[PDB]
């Protein structure tokens, strides 16, 4: 019947699902931490919500592939994609 | 994903 | 890059053979960068770029013609470059005060094996506070380096069976209006048929505007439109919203270019005639040239992408002062109590990335001007001359061509 | 009705009589800036004799308003004009007149 | 039969719809810049006041061309007319009709521009009113927000058989009248180290024959 009831909050999901989306994650952060860098936390920077069901659940879709970045973070890239 | 939240990795 | 200014002549004494001597009397040193050019386009870019255009400078002493093309030697104050066309053999070349200019090949020649299509007019760009001389010659005296090579060899002055002084045109200052754009860089506008049943915009049309890619400055749009009430709209980018970019009626009375905007944007006209110190009476705030009002922060519950207060397009059924563009969605409190001002073709600003106001239009001025006397003791001004020249005016916009 | 904006004073006390004739060199543009008329540029002046309907009553109360010299700026409301018919091929119907009239002489 | 289709296709569209035309010309200007603002500057108090010689009519045209306008560089471009600057009203006999907008009025003490033009300019850069008297009631309708980022330029305007001499100040001249308290007259802003002289309406082709100057934009 193609019925998926794991559309639910990420505080009520199931405990390995929640694992296996945050393992690459933690991969990817223990890499770029074993060679050590310098971390940028400013204030300005805070663009976590600024583009335009059951529990409320209205998804939408953000295009942010337009925005140039820098050659460090490029060259960081390469080397986690490496 | 390293976009968000002004995270820069720098030398 | 700018305030390059290509002091063109008029097409109509266009050359299609023969050959004519030329010369550039240079007072400035440094940049004078002159030479010749079809009518053809381009009336705000590069002096030579292409093959299109030919000029000589002297800053970076070099040739203009499909590229830099090092030739010749620099030149200073005082200096003719002396440019001679030869349509007989199409081998261009030129004299520095009589003196050959050596190329990159050491062959002392400019520029050879062109197509002649509709000739090559004089053409001259000064940059920044450069003076010039534009010379033909209406006689032999009149030039001072003819006399050494082109008289000798068989070339004659650019006005020499003329009997009337020749005009020369130059580039605008100010973008024209509606510049109705067919073959820009990244400038296409699409239209649609749905008439009935569908069209929620009721415009019958799409208007629809989009760039290419990576290439946005900040521009002032205008389109045309051939063919509450008069319910339409214009496809303006859809609501992305990339720097909450302004919309607004515009008047014709806007004159004023730049990369910014939404600034004071010229005096905003508010005028309380009566009797002022004694008792003022009602006020009449009339219209900016760019009364154009803000995007603000539309939609403030984030609701759908391509959405987002834009595109009304209507007209209400009486001029009552303020029209149906005091909306847009919700309220945004303006009141544009106005005069009757104008109504023509539509233009909104935007600005927009890919998720004309345009300034390339060449203007001659009159061949006689009126006079200007100036005396001491007061510097009284003493004109009296007549001098009229009738100009068609307003046949749907405001203007005077 | 006329609303007589003098730009110039003249006489101050001649007024034109029944059996005279107003010479005058009007330029009267309509609304919007647009000069349907001028006798001015003509070289030849308009005569025209008051109290026979030889001219437009805004022309003819216009007139009897301004002095000898008195340099004038008219304005002529739909009533005294063409009518809603207007006048055919120059006046838009329903349309105001505006007139700078500018009387040399009184005959 | 063609009397009939002459007449019906003569109030089509012949009314008044298509290309119109006119011909007149103008535009005059002076030189000295005053381009004052904050900082490292002058205050912002200025008077103006000039004197007519010879003004008359059907030169040309009834209409002879002498206007004073608010804004002479923000008003207009001169890419039709100084003082008829769009916006600006332009200074005149009694009226205020600003270029392709309509705000005269009436006001008493007006007249044409007749011997002995006892008249008086009034400025703020704080906020722009109007006091400008002749002979006593002024002429009343503010216009706020003016010259904004600066450099102004006080004009007078002038198209043909005008013959007037120049009163800013009297520096160079003499000042007929005087300045009330507050506005200053205008033997300011003349700036030192240089010469002051009279140009054009930010033009560089006058008069000329075959020496055509070429200048650049400055």
């Known amino acids: 019947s193609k019925i998926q009831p794991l559309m639910k909050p990420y505080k009520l999901l199931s405990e390995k699902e929640k694992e296996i989306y945050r393992w690459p994650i933690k991969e990817s952060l223990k890499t770029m931490l074993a060679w050590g860098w310098r971390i940028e936390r400013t204030r300005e920077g805070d663009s976590m919500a600024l583009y335009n069901a059951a529990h409320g659940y209205s998804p939408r879709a953000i295009d942010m592939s337009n925005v140039t970045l820098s050659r460090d973070l490029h060259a960081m890239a390469e080397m986690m994609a490496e | 994903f390293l976009q968000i939240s002004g995270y820069v990795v720098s030398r | 890059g700018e305030r390059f200014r290509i002091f063109r002549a008029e097409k109509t004494y266009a050359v299609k053979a023969g050959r004519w001597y030329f010369e550039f009397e240079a007072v400035t040193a440094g940049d004078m960068r002159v030479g010749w050019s079809r009518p053809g386009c381009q009336p705000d870019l590069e002096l030579g770029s292409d093959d299109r255009a030919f000029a000589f400078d002297g800053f970076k002493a070099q040739r203009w013609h499909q590229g830099n093309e090092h030739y010749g030697r620099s030149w200073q104050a005082g200096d003719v470059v002396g440019c001679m066309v030869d349509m007989n053999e199409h081998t261009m070349m030129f004299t520095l005060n009589g003196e050959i200019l050596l190329d990159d090949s050491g062959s002392e020649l400019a520029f050879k094996d062109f197509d002649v299509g509709d000739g090559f007019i004089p053409v001259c760009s000064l940059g920044v506070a450069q003076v010039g001389r534009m010379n033909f010659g209406k006689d032999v005296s009149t030039l001072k380096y003819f006399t050494i090579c082109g008289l000798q060899e068989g070339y004659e002055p650019f006005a020499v069976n003329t009997n009337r002084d020749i005009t020369m045109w130059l580039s605008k200052r100010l973008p024209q209006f509606l510049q109705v754009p067919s073959n820009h860089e990244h400038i296409e506008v699409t239209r649609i048929d749905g008439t009935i049943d569908s069209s929620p915009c009721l415009k019958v049309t799409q208007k629809s505007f989009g760039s290419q890619n990576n290439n946005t400055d900040i521009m002032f749009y205008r389109l045309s439109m051939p063919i509450s009430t008069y319910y339409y709209s214009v496809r303006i980018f859809p609501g992305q919203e990339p720097a909450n970019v302004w919309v607004g009626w515009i008047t014709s009375d806007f004159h004023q270019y730049d990369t910014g905007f939404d600034l004071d944007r010229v005096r905003t006209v508010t005028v309380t005639l009566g009797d002022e110190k004694g008792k003022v009476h009602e006020s009449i705030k009339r219209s900016n040239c760019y009364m154009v009002c803000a995007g603000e922060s539309m939609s403030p519950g984030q609701g759908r992408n391509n959405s987002n207060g834009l595109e009304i397009g209507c007209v209400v059924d009486a001029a009552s002062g303020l029209l149906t563009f005091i909306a847009n969605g919700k309220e945004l409190s303006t009141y544009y109590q106005v005069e009757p001002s104008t109504k023509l073709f539509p233009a909104v600003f935007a600005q927009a990335t890919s998720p004309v106001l345009w300034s390339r239009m060449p203007n001659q001025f009159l061949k006689v001007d009126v006079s200007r006397i100036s005396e001491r003791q007061g510097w009284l001004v003493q004109c009296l001359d007549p001098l009229q020249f009738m100009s068609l005016h307003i046949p749907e916009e405001n203007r005077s061509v | ?84 018919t207007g006048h055919p091929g120059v006046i838009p119907p329903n349309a105001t007149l505006i007139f700078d009239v500018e009387l040399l002489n009184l005959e | ?212 100057d070429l200048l650049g934009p400055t």
């Open chain 5, 1 to 212: 039969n063609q009397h009939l289709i002459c007449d019906n296709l003569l109030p089509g569209r012949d009314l008044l719809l298509q290309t119109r035309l006119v011909n007149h010309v103008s535009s005059m200007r002076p030189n000295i810049f005053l381009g004052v603002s904050e900082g490292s500057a002058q205050y912002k108090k200025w008077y103006y006041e000039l004197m007519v010689d010879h003004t008359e009519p059907f030169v040309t045209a009834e209409a002879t061309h002498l206007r004073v306008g608010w804004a002479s560089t923000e008003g207009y471009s001169p890419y039709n007319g100084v003082g008829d600057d769009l916006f600006s009203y332009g200074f005149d006999g009694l009226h205020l009709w600003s270029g392709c907008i309509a705000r005269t009025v009436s006001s008493p003490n007006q007249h044409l521009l007749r011997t002995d033009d006892v008249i008086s300019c009034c400025l703020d850069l704080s906020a722009p009113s109007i006091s400008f008297r002749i002979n006593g009631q002024p002429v009343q309708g503010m216009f706020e927000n003016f010259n904004i980022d600066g450099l102004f330029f006080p004009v007078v305007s002038f198209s043909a058989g005008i013959k007037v001499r120049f009163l800013l100040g009297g520096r160079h001249g003499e000042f007929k009248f005087l300045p009330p308290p507050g506005y200053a007259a205008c033997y300011e802003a003349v700036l030192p180290k240089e010469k002051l002289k009279v140009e054009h309406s930010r033009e560089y082709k006058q008069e000329r024959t075959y020496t055509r």
């Open chain 4, 1 to 84: 009705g006329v609303e007589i904006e003098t730009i110039s004073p003249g006489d101050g006390r001649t007024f034109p009589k029944k059996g005279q004739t107003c010479v005058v060199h009007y330029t009267g543009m309509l609304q919007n800036g647009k000069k349907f008329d001028s006798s001015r540029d003509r070289n030849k002046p308009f005569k025209f004799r008051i109290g026979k309907q030889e001219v437009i009553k805004g022309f003819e109360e216009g007139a009897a308003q301004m002095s000898l010299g008195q340099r004038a700026k008219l304005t002529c409301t739909p009533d005294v004009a063409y009518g809603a």
